[PDB]
Amino acid sequence: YIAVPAEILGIILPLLLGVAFLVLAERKVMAFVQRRKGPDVVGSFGLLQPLADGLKLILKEPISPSSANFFLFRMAPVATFMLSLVAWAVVPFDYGMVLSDLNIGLLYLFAISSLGVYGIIIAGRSSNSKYAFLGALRSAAQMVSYEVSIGLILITVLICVGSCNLSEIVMAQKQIWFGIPLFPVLVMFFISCLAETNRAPFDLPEAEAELVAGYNVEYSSMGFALFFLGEYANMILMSGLCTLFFLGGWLPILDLPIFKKIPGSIWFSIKVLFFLFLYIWVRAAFPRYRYDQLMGLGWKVFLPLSLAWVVSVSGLLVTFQWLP
Amino acid sequence: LVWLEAMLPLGIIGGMLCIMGNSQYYIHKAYHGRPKHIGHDEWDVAMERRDKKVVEKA
Amino acid sequence: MDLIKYFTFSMIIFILGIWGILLNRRNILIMLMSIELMLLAVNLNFLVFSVSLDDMMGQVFALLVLTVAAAESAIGLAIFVITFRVRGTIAVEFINSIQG
Amino acid sequence: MFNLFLAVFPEIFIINATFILLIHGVVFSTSKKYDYPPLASNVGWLGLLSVLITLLLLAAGAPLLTIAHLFWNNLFRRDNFTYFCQIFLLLSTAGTISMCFDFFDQERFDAFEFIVLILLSTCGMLFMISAYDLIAMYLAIELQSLCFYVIAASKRKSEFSTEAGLKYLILGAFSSGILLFGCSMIYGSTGATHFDQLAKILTGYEITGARSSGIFMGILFIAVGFLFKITAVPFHMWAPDIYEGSPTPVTAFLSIAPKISIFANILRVFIYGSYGATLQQIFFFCSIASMILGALAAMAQTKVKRLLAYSSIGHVGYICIGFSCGTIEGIQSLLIGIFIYALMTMDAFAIVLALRQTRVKYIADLGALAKTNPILAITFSITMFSYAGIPPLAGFCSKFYLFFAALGCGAYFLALVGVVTSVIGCFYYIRLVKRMFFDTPRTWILYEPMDRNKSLLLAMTSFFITLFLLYPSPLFSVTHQMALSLYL
Amino acid sequence: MNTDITALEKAQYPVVDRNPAFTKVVGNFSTLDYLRFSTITGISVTVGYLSGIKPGIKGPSMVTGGLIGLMGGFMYAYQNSAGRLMGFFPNDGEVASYQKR
Amino acid sequence: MASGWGITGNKGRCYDFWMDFSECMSHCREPKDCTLLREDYLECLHHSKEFQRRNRIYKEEQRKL
Amino acid sequence: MILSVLSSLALVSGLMVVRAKNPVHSVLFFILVFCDTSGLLLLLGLDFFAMIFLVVYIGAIAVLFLFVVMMFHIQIAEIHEEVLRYLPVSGIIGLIFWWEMFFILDNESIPLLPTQRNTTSLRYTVYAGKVRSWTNLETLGNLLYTYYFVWFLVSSLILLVAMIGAIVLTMHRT
Amino acid sequence: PVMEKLRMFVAQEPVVAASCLIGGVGLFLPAVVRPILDSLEAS
Amino acid sequence: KDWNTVFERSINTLFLTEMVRGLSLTLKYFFDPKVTINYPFEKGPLSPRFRGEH
Amino acid sequence: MMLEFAPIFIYLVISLLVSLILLGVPFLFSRFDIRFYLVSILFLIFDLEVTFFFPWAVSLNKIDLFGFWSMMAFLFILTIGFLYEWKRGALDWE
* HEC assignment per residue over chain D: CHHHHHHHHHHHHHHHHHHHHHHHHHHHHCCCCCCCCCCHHHHHHHHHHHHHHHHHHHHCCCHHHHCCCCCCCCCCCCCHHHHHHHHHHHHHHHHHHHCCHHHHHHCCCCCCHHHHHHHHHHHHHHHHHCCCEHHHHHHHHHHHHHHHHHHHCCCCCCHHHHHHHHHHHHHHHHHHHHHHHHHHHHHHHHCCCEHHHHHHHHCCCCCCCCCCHHHHHHHHHHHHHHHHHCCCCCCCCHHHHHHHHCCHHHHHHHHHHHHHHHHHHHHHHHHCCCCCHHHHHHHHHHHHHHHHHHHHHHHHCCEHHHHHHHHHHHHHHHHHHHHHHCCHHHHHHHHHHHHHHHHHHHHHHHHHHHHHHHCCCEHHHHCCHHHHCHHHHHHHHHHHHHHHCCCCCHHHHHHHHHHHHHCCCCCHHHHHHHHHHHHHHHHHHHHHHHHHHCCCCCCCCCCCCCCHHHHHHHHHHHHHHHHHHHCCHHHHHHHHHHHHHCCC
DSSP characters for J38-67? Answer: HHHHHHHHHHHHHHHHHHHHHHHHHHHHHH
Nearest-neighbour CA in chain B from J1: distance (Å): 6
Q: Which of B6, B19, B21 sits opposite A28 (nearest CB)?
A: B6
Q: How many angstroms separate the CA atoms of C45 and D180, rounded?
A: 10
Does residue G159 lie within any of the structural domains?
Answer: yes
Q: What is the CATH number of the domain that holds C29?
A: 1.10.287.3510
D274: β partners:
none
Q: How many angstroms separate the CA atoms of J42 and C67, rounded?
A: 14
Nearest-neighbour CA in chain D from F32: distance (Å): 7
Three-state SS at A177: coil
Neighbour count for residue A224 (Cβ, 10 Å): 18
Largest CA distance in chain F: 52
> Do G169 and C82 make contact, defined as CB atoms within 8 angstroms?
yes
Residues of G in Cβ contact (< 8 Å) with A117: 59, 63
Does residue C98 lie within any of the structural domains?
Answer: no
If one counts the domains in chain C, the total is 1
Q: Which of residues 2-41 of B touch A (CB under 8 A)?
A: 2-3, 5-6, 8-10, 12-25, 27-28, 30-31, 35-40
Domain range for G140 is 2-169
Mutate to test the interface with B, among A45, A93, A280 (most CBs of B within 10 A): A93
Largest CA distance in chain I: 74
> Do B2 and I30 make contact, defined as CB atoms within 8 angstroms?
no
Angle between helices A117-126 and A221-246 (to 10 degrees): 160
Which residue does chain J place closest to G41, by CA atoms? J2
> Do A164 and G137 make contact, defined as CB atoms within 8 angstroms?
yes
Phi, psi angle pair for D362, to nearest 5°: -110, 155
Among candidates D460, D387, D458, D456, which has minimal Cα distance to D422?
A: D387
Mutate to test the interface with I, among H3, H4, H5, H20 (most CBs of I within 10 A): H4
Q: Quick one: A16 exposed, middle or buried, by C-beta within 10 A (0-12, 13-18, 19+)?
A: middle
Which are the contacts of E25, defined by CB distance < 8 A and separation ≥ 6? Answer: D3, E78, E81, E82, E85
Q: What is the CA radius of gyration of chain E?
A: 18
Integer CA distances (angstroms), I50 to I36, I37, I45, I46, I53, in order? 22, 19, 10, 7, 10
> Do I31 and B6 make contact, defined as CB atoms within 8 angstroms?
no
Report whether A157 contacts A178 (CB < 8 A).
yes
Domain range for C61 is 2-87
* F31 in reach of chain D (CB within 8 A): yes
Residue type, F35: T
Report whether D438 contacts D323 (CB < 8 A).
no
Q: How many angstroms separate the CA atoms of G88 and A18, rounded?
A: 59
Q: How many angstroms separate the CA atoms of D354 and D166, rounded?
A: 28
Nearest-neighbour CA in chain C from D157: distance (Å): 6
Q: Does domain J5-88 have CATH number 1.20.58.1610?
A: yes
Does residue C23 lie within any of the structural domains?
Answer: yes
- Residue D98 sits at the vertex; the CA angle it makes with D96 and D102, to the nearest 5 degrees, is 110
Which residue does chain F place closest to G113, by CA atoms? F55
Q: How many angstroms separate the CA atoms of A8 and A98, rounded?
A: 10
Nearest-neighbour CA in chain A from B52: distance (Å): 18
* A314 in reach of chain H (CB within 8 A): yes
Report whether D154 contacts D161 (CB < 8 A).
yes
Q: Which residues of D161-194 are buried (b: 16+ CB within 10 A; e: fewer)?
A: bbbbbbbbbbbbbbbbbbbbbbbbbbbbbbbbbb
Report whether D472 contacts D398 (CB < 8 A).
no
Report whether A277 contacts A29 (CB < 8 A).
yes
Three-state SS at A171: helix
Does residue G8 lie within any of the structural domains?
Answer: yes
Neighbour count for residue A309 (Cβ, 10 Å): 23
> Do D116 and G164 make contact, defined as CB atoms within 8 angstroms?
yes
Q: How many angstroms separate the CA atoms of D80 and D100, rounded?
A: 31
Q: Give the CA count within 13 Å in the CB-facing half-sphere of F11.
A: 7
Nearest-neighbour CA in chain D from G151: distance (Å): 7
F5: β partners:
F11
Q: What are the sequence ranges of the domains in chain J?
A: 5-88
Angle between helices D80-98 and D452-467 (to 10 degrees): 130
* E11 in reach of chain D (CB within 8 A): yes
Look up residue A58 and give its DSSP letter: H
* C98 in reach of chain G (CB within 8 A): no
DSSP characters for A116-139? Answer: THHHHHHHHHHT--HHHHHHHHHH
Q: How many angstroms separate the CA atoms of D65 and D71, rounded?
A: 13
Neighbour count for residue F14 (Cβ, 10 Å): 23
Helices (H), G20-124: 23-43, 47-52, 62-72, 76-79, 87-101, 105-108
> Do D139 and G162 make contact, defined as CB atoms within 8 angstroms?
no
DSSP characters for B14-41? Answer: HHHHHHHHHHHHHHHHHHHSSPPPTT--
Among candidates H20, G157, J51, C36, which has minimal Cα distance to A147?
A: J51
Residues of B in Cβ contact (< 8 Å) with I36: none
Q: Give the CA count within 13 Å in the CB-facing half-sphere of C73.
A: 33
Report whether A166 contacts A92 (CB < 8 A).
yes
Q: Which of residues 26-85 of J touch C (CB under 8 A)?
A: 32, 34, 37, 41, 44, 48, 51-52
Among candidates D163, D101, D99, D151, which has minimal Cα distance to D122?
A: D151
Domain range for D159 is 1-488
Q: Quick one: D386 exposed, middle or buried, by C-beta within 10 A (0-12, 13-18, 19+)?
A: buried
Nearest-neighbour CA in chain C from J41: distance (Å): 6
Three-state SS at H22: helix
Among candidates C83, J81, C17, G18, which has minimal Cα distance to D169?
A: C83
Q: Quick one: D466 exposed, middle or buried, by C-beta within 10 A (0-12, 13-18, 19+)?
A: middle
Does residue C18 lie within any of the structural domains?
Answer: yes
Q: Quick one: B48 exposed, middle or buried, by C-beta within 10 A (0-12, 13-18, 19+)?
A: exposed
Q: Which of A7, A15, A22 sits opposite B27 (nearest CB)?
A: A7
Neighbour count for residue E1 (Cβ, 10 Å): 13
A94: β partners:
A97
* I29 in reach of chain B (CB within 8 A): no
If one counts the domains in chain D, the total is 1
Q: What is the resolution of this structure in A?
A: 2.8
* D27 in reach of chain J (CB within 8 A): yes
Q: How many angstroms separate the CA atoms of G53 and G47, rounded?
A: 10
Q: How many angstroms separate the CA atoms of A34 and A32, rounded?
A: 5
> Do H27 and J72 make contact, defined as CB atoms within 8 angstroms?
yes
> Do C98 and D142 make contact, defined as CB atoms within 8 angstroms?
no
User: Chains touching chain F at 3 or more Cβ pairs under 8 angstroms?
Assistant: C, D, G
Q: How many angstroms separate the CA atoms of D432 and D449, rounded?
A: 20
Among candidates D193, D67, D62, D177, which has minimal Cα distance to D131?
A: D193
Q: Which of residues 17-36 of C touch G (CB under 8 A)?
A: 17-20, 22-27, 29-30, 33-34, 36
Q: How many angstroms separate the CA atoms of I6 and E68, rounded?
A: 35
| Touching chains C and D? (3+ Cβ pairs < 8 A) | yes
Which are the contacts of D482, defined by CB distance < 8 A and separation ≥ 6? Answer: D80, D81, D84, D85, D331, D332, D335
Q: How many angstroms separate the CA atoms of J44 and C67, rounded?
A: 10
Asked if residue E14 has a cis previous peptide bond (ω within 30° of 0), the answer is no
Q: Which residues of A87-111 are buried (b: 16+ CB within 10 A; e: fewer)?
A: bbbbbbbbbbbbbbbbbbbbbbbbb
Nearest-neighbour CA in chain D from C1: distance (Å): 16
Among candidates C33, C12, C36, C10, which has minimal Cα distance to C23?
A: C33
If one counts the domains in chain G, the total is 1
Q: What is the CATH number of the domain that holds G132?
A: 1.20.120.1200
Query: If you count them, how many residues does chain E have?
Result: 101
Residues of B in Cβ contact (< 8 Å) with J14: none
Helices (H), C23-92: 28-53, 57-87
Neighbour count for residue D291 (Cβ, 10 Å): 28
Integer CA distances (angstroms), A157 to A103, A110, G25, J23, in order? 15, 13, 38, 39
Among candidates G148, A176, A311, A150, which has minimal Cα distance to J57?
A: A311
Residues of G in Cβ contact (< 8 Å) with F9: 133-134, 138-139, 142
Which residue does chain J place closest to A140, by CA atoms? J36
Among candidates D57, D20, D66, which has minimal Cα distance to E36?
A: D57
Nearest-neighbour CA in chain D from E31: distance (Å): 18
Integer CA distances (angstroms), A248 to A87, A108, A254, C81, in order? 19, 20, 11, 48
Does residue C52 lie within any of the structural domains?
Answer: yes
Three-state SS at H15: helix
Q: How many angstroms separate the CA atoms of G108 and D206, rounded?
A: 15
Q: How many angstroms separate the CA atoms of D445 and D360, rounded?
A: 9
Q: Is the dihedral of CA A206, A207, A209, A215 positive or negative?
A: negative
Q: How many angstroms separate the CA atoms of E66 and E64, rounded?
A: 5
Three-state SS at F55: helix
D362: β partners:
D303
Nearest-neighbour CA in chain I from B18: distance (Å): 27
Chain center to CA of D250: 12
* D233 in reach of chain G (CB within 8 A): no
Look up residue A173 and give its DSSP letter: T
Q: What is the CA radius of gyration of chain I?
A: 24
